[PDB]
RNA sequence: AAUUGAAGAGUUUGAUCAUGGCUCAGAUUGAACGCUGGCGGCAGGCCUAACACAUGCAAGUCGAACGGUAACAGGAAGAAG
């Protein structure tokens, strides 16, 4: 049973001949509580109907994150624009700790207990994306080994 | 057995993305102030002028070193009815 939760929204103009008209976005992630996680953005002219637009997108660009136990096995890092993240196992209990607009992204993801911060600016728009692609470029003992010998 | 450790937001531009400053959520105090006020255990109490200081008390003991007896406590002696 997949999982949802807003992240944020605010408005935005264009401001043509008539005058200002507006129109709202949304963004969320979605998860099932063992890994495969994506996300989604839209707009629309009216919040009730942005947040389903961009839920009903956020349906595509599925991924597929190893996961062992219940936290992550190894650092990695990230980058995307100008934001930049870290993240440690911490193995059992401590529960998660991180900031604002990146412990939605890593709850989803179904492990239970990890630790992480974010450097340098942080607006939520380009903070996402960073952790998508660092459990990307993630590998657990199986692959290496699958290169290399045993 | 003796080192399990990393939370962010607000803020300009009609709206955007950055770089940049400012401020706020914590823990502390040899602490002062405002209001309020039950009990017991511990600990602590001139940073400011090394400014000038009334009055009491904070360094004596040995007669088993010595010449001695100005204040007792007893002791022979003499004057007491």
């Known amino acids: 049973?997949?999982?949802?939760?807003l992240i944020a929204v605010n408005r935005v103009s264009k401001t043509v001949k008539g005058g200002r008209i507006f129109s709202f976005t949304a963004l969320t992630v979605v998860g099932d509580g063992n890994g495969r996680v994506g996300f989604g953005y839209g707009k629309a002219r009216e919040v009730p109907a942005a947040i389903q637009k961009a839920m009903e997108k956020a349906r595509r660009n599925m991924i597929n994150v190893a996961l062992n136990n219940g936290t992550l096995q190894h650092?990695?890092?990230?980058?995307h624009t100008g934001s930049r993240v870290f993240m440690q196992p911490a193995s059992e209990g401590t529960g998660i700790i991180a900031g604002g607009?990146?412990?939605a992204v890593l709850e989803v993801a179904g492990?239970?207990?990890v630790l992480a911060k974010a450097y340098g600016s942080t607006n939520p728009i380009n903070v996402v994306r960073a952790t998508i692609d660092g459990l990307?470029?993630?590998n657990s003992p199986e692959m290496v080994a699958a290169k290399r010998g045993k």
């Open 1 to 5: 049973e997949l999982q949802e939760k």
């Open 111 to 113: 492990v239970h207990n």
């Open 75 to 79: 650092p990695v890092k990230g980058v």
């Open 101 to 103: 607009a990146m412990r």
């Open 136 to 138: 990307e470029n993630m």
